[PDB]
Amino acid sequence: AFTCHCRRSCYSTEYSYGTCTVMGINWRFCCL
Ligand SMILES: [Cl-]
């Protein structure tokens, strides 16, 4: 499985696969 969170910054165990927009702002779509 990939486990993904929308974050300001991806954690050191993750990479950025794309973006989320919520609350009018961008987040990164971070998965490990
Ligand atoms: Cl794969």
Q: How far is the CA of 2 from the centre of ligand 1 (A)?
A: 9
Resolution (A): 1.9
Domain boundaries, the chain: 1-32
Dihedral sign, CA of 5, 8, 10, 15?
positive
Angle among Cα 21, 24, 26 to the nearest 5 degrees reads 40
- For residue 23, report the phi and psi dihedrals to the nearest 5 degrees: 60, 25
Q: Which amino acid is at 1?
A: A
Dihedral sign, CA of 9, 16, 14, 5?
positive
Q: How far is the CA of 1 from the centre of ligand 1 (A)?
A: 9
Residue 17 corresponds to which tokens in the numbers above?
């696969």
DSSP characters for 17-28?
EEEEEETTEEEE
Q: How far is the CA of 22 from the centre of ligand 1 (A)?
A: 26
Specify whether the CB–CB gap between 4 and 31 falls below 8 A: yes
Give me the torsion for CA of 15, 21, 25, 28, rounded to 10°. Answer: 0
Three-class SS state of 4: strand
